[PDB]
Design a protein around this motif. Structure first.
Motif, PDB file in Angstrom:
ATOM      1  N   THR B  53       0.817  -1.210   0.000  1.00 39.42           N
ATOM      2  CA  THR B  53       0.000   0.000   0.000  1.00 39.42           C
ATOM      3  C   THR B  53       0.851   1.260   0.000  1.00 39.42           C
ATOM      4  O   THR B  53       0.339   2.341  -0.303  1.00 39.42           O
ATOM      5  N   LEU B  54       2.130   1.144   0.349  1.00 35.01           N
ATOM      6  CA  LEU B  54       3.056   2.245   0.124  1.00 35.01           C
ATOM      7  C   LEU B  54       3.102   2.623  -1.350  1.00 35.01           C
ATOM      8  O   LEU B  54       3.192   3.806  -1.695  1.00 35.01           O
ATOM      9  N   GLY B  55       3.034   1.628  -2.234  1.00 30.66           N
ATOM     10  CA  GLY B  55       3.154   1.908  -3.656  1.00 30.66           C
ATOM     11  C   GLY B  55       1.986   2.702  -4.207  1.00 30.66           C
ATOM     12  O   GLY B  55       2.168   3.635  -4.992  1.00 30.66           O
ATOM     13  N   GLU B  56       0.767   2.344  -3.806  1.00 22.43           N
ATOM     14  CA  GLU B  56      -0.419   2.928  -4.426  1.00 22.43           C
ATOM     15  C   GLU B  56      -0.516   4.423  -4.145  1.00 22.43           C
ATOM     16  O   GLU B  56      -0.557   5.238  -5.073  1.00 22.43           O
ATOM     17  N   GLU B  60       5.648   8.446   1.847  1.00 27.12           N
ATOM     18  CA  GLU B  60       7.050   8.525   2.226  1.00 27.12           C
ATOM     19  C   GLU B  60       7.288   8.156   3.688  1.00 27.12           C
ATOM     20  O   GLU B  60       8.379   8.398   4.209  1.00 27.12           O
ATOM     21  N   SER B  61       6.298   7.571   4.357  1.00 25.84           N
ATOM     22  CA  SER B  61       6.404   7.259   5.774  1.00 25.84           C
ATOM     23  C   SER B  61       5.908   5.846   6.028  1.00 25.84           C
ATOM     24  O   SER B  61       4.962   5.388   5.383  1.00 25.84           O
ATOM     25  N   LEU B  62       6.543   5.166   6.979  1.00 29.20           N
ATOM     26  CA  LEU B  62       6.223   3.787   7.312  1.00 29.20           C
ATOM     27  C   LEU B  62       5.954   3.661   8.803  1.00 29.20           C
ATOM     28  O   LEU B  62       6.638   4.278   9.622  1.00 29.20           O
ATOM     29  N   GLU B  63       4.966   2.842   9.147  1.00 32.75           N
ATOM     30  CA  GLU B  63       4.535   2.660  10.526  1.00 32.75           C
ATOM     31  C   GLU B  63       5.084   1.344  11.057  1.00 32.75           C
ATOM     32  O   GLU B  63       4.909   0.294  10.429  1.00 32.75           O
TER      33      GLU B  63
END
Ligand SMILES: Nc1ncnc2c1ncn2[C@@H]1O[C@H](COP(=O)(O)OP(=O)(O)OP(=O)(O)O)[C@@H](O)[C@H]1O
Ligand SMILES: [Mg+2]
Ligand SMILES: [Zn+2]
Lengths: 49, 624
Positions: B53-56, B60-63
């Protein structure tokens, strides 16, 4: 009652103007029908066309 | 090295241990293993799906969740607690590489991935912090009291050599101290050097002030406060007045020159943020067919009328008026030369102790664009426009009143009878012309004030005088009263049976609070969709009835010797019929809606009259 005491201010203010228009809401059925019809058509859309 | 090898520190401190190359490589490899080898109860790739879902959205941020990292690998959790600053760079490079491994060429659509830790055990109040907590990971609560604007911060800096005119390549800014260069590689100089603003890339910056929530403060003491710095995607999330949870690092401001500054050597502290969370009316195609379904049930009107203030007893007429003014109508322009407003104003006149402020409170929780102002009290917004100075930025600002700020919405004025001359002039202008004029400090302008007014007031003396008309019980004047469509009179009549149910309800409230209904959440969204897309019609087959109804109510009003009836009453009739029709998401104003509307206006007129006139009229108008 005179027009003078029908206003809540001094009566010399009237001399300043040029035309003084006194509009009286007189009750009469035939006028009411026409004005009501006028208003209701404007809200319909007729007067826009 | 191995994982159980790292847990024997062989350095002076944690910081010097983490910076050795051998231990950094170890932890980078072990972070890659954490990223690409996790599994939930069922086994789903918790981070795999997050990285797709980072791609869609291309974020620029990850949990990341601290509980999982404590589950798997504990020395990493200890180092995250003690020296987060060094750990996070390593963890952010690992994330970026892992993402590229699943989405090629994403280093262009975004050049760096930020890690935000989600959960973390220990939660502090602002007053507990001490000097043992410096340079450590913390989690705090509080309330947001101030906010600044978005300023840019240097990220990738390019310098000019002012002898040979060259652009020196990207240099990184650490968020600690400003970077300066000293050597030109082409001409071999230490001469003047200046930053190239055009070729530099910047970062988002904002500062916030957090205050202890008043409720938790122990008796006798005062709330404490601290400052928070937010960078990149965290800017503009929490608006002033909300309660938030902050995860970040506790640092000292290296003030300045400790020389001079006579007195004790004290230091100041800040918090640098990592994650913020909070402790809507938009709809979707799932709920649209449910809207339409509920709209086909005959009698949606009486459901709505009983879903309003769902905690005040009785007073059906005021709730009907509230629904009417909370749905609205259709504004009109006849070939750009004639305008008839769409909103319906509601005045409340009632004795002390009839719960008018409670309804005014409900309207504000239920509505999209609603503002609150007070006549004789202390409020965060006034009614008059003005030019004042901003205490923070030291700038001159143009501010409108609540009337301007609530355009296409509703304005709630409490204690309507205690206004000063200035507020009264503003109200009159807004209601009459629907636009605010200002001529101050070189600014001449007109602003738009298409707003709905709901007001509450107390009679003269304190109690209602039924032997005199409305104009002689209240301190407002006919010019202002005539600009309201619906007038509601709440009378404290001493009736024995009603007190039984009123007191029952009130006592039940306290007993339960000791230490038809549509759900409000769907009503909130139905109100926005209906008022966004529903513009009902007035096909004139239904003109014959109203002409003759108006004729009769005019002939009767003069005979009985009371208030005059003007065409504003008929305009109100049609404008209220629009709202009753729009309730059914309808397509052609029905005669049922017209008949429902007629009652409101006729009842208002009949009930705002002297006792003798009222007895005459309540019999004459029995058919409507
Ligand atoms: N009909 C009612 N049903 C339920 N609660 C009521 C009713 N009338 C009054 N109350 C309660 O009594 C109190 C009245 O306080 P409130 O300020 O709402 O009255 P008010 O008429 O707005 O005040 P005032 O006119 O004196 O400024 C509140 O607790 C309110 O909930
Ligand atoms: Mg009150
Ligand atoms: Zn040079």
């Amino acid at each position: 009652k005179s027009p003078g005491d029908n206003i809540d201010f001094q009566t010399t203010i009237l001399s300043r103007f040029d035309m003084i228009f006194i509009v009286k809401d007189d009750h009469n059925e035939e006028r009411d029908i026409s004005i009501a019809n006028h208003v209701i058509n404007i809200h319909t859309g007729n007067a826009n066309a | 090295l191995t994982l159980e090898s790292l847990s024997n520190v062989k350095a002076n401190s944690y910081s010097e241990w983490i910076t050795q190359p051998n231990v950094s490589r170890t932890i980078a490899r072990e972070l890659k293993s954490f990223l690409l080898e996790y599994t939930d109860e069922t086994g789903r790739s918790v981070y795999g799906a997050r990285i797709r879902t980072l791609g869609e959205m291309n974020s620029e941020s990850l949990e990341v969740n601290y509980r999982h990292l404590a589950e798997s690998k504990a020395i990493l959790a200890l180092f995250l607690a003690k020296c987060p600053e060094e750990m996070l760079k390593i963890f952010d490079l690992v994330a970026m590489e892992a993402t590229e491994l699943h989405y090629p060429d994403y280093a262009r659509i975004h050049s760096e991935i930020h890690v935000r830790i989600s959960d973390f055990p220990t939660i502090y109040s602002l007053r507990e912090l001490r000097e043992s907590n410096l340079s450590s990971l913390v989690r705090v609560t509080g309330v947001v009291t101030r906010r600044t604007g978005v300023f840019p911060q240097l990220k990738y800096v390019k310098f000019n050599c002012l002898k040979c005119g060259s652009i020196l390549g990207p240099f990184f800014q650490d968020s600690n101290e400003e970077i300066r260069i000293s050597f030109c590689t082409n001409c071999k100089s230490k001469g003047p050097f200046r930053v190239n603003g055009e070729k530099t890339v910047y970062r988002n910056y904002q500062r916030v002030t957090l205050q202890e929530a008043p409720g938790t403060v122990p008796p006798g003491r005062l709330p404490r406060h601290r400052e928070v710095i937010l960078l990149a995607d965290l800017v503009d999330v929490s608006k002033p007045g909300e309660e938030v949870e902050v995860t970040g690092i506790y640092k000292n401001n290296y003030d300045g020159n400790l020389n001079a500054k006579n007195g004790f050597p004290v230091f100041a502290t800040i918090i640098e943020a990592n994650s913020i969370k909070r402790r809507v009316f938009s709809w979707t195609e799932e709920e649209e067919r449910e809207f339409r379904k509920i709209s086909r049930d005959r009698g949606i009107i009486d459901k709505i009328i009983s879903s309003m203030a769902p905690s005040i007893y009785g007073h059906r007429d005021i709730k009907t008026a509230v629904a009417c003014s909370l749905f609205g109508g259709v504004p009109k322009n006849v070939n750009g030369k004639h305008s008839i407003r769409g909103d319906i104003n509601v005045l409340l006149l009632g004795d002390p102790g009839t719960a008018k402020s409670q309804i005014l409170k409900y309207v504000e929780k239920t509505a999209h664009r609603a503002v609150f102002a007070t006549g004789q009290g202390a409020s965060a917004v006034g009614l008059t426009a003005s030019v004042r100075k901003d205490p923070i930025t030291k700038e001159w600002t143009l501010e409108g009143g609540a009337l301007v700020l609530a355009d296409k919405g509703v304005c709630l004025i409490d204690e309507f009878d205690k206004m000063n001359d200035q507020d009264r002039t503003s109200i009159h202008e807004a209601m009459e012309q629907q636009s605010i004029s200002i001529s101050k400090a070189g600014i001449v302008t007109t602003l738009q004030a298409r707003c709905s007014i709901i007001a509450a007031a107390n009679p003269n003396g304190g109690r209602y005088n039924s032997t005199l008309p409305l104009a002689q019980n209240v301190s407002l004047t006919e010019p202002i009263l005539s600009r309201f469509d619906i007038l509601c009179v709440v009378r404290d009549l001493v009736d024995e049976e009603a007190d039984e149910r009123l007191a029952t309800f009130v006592v039940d409230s306290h007993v339960r609070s000791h230490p038809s209904p549509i759900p409000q959440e769907l009503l909130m969204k139905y109100i926005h969709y209906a008022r966004t897309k529903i513009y009902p019609k007035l096909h004139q087959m239904d003109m014959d009835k109203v002409s003759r109804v108006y004729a009769d109510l005019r002939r009767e009003s003069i005979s009985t010797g009371s208030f005059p009836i003007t065409v504003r009453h008929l305009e109100s009739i049609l404008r209220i019929a629009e709202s009753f029709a729009k309730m059914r998401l309808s397509e052609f104003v029905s005669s049922y809606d017209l008949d429902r509307a007629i009652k409101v206006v006729v009842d208002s007129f009949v009930d705002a009259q002297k006792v003798s006139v009222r007895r005459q009229l309540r019999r004459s108008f029995a058919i409507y």
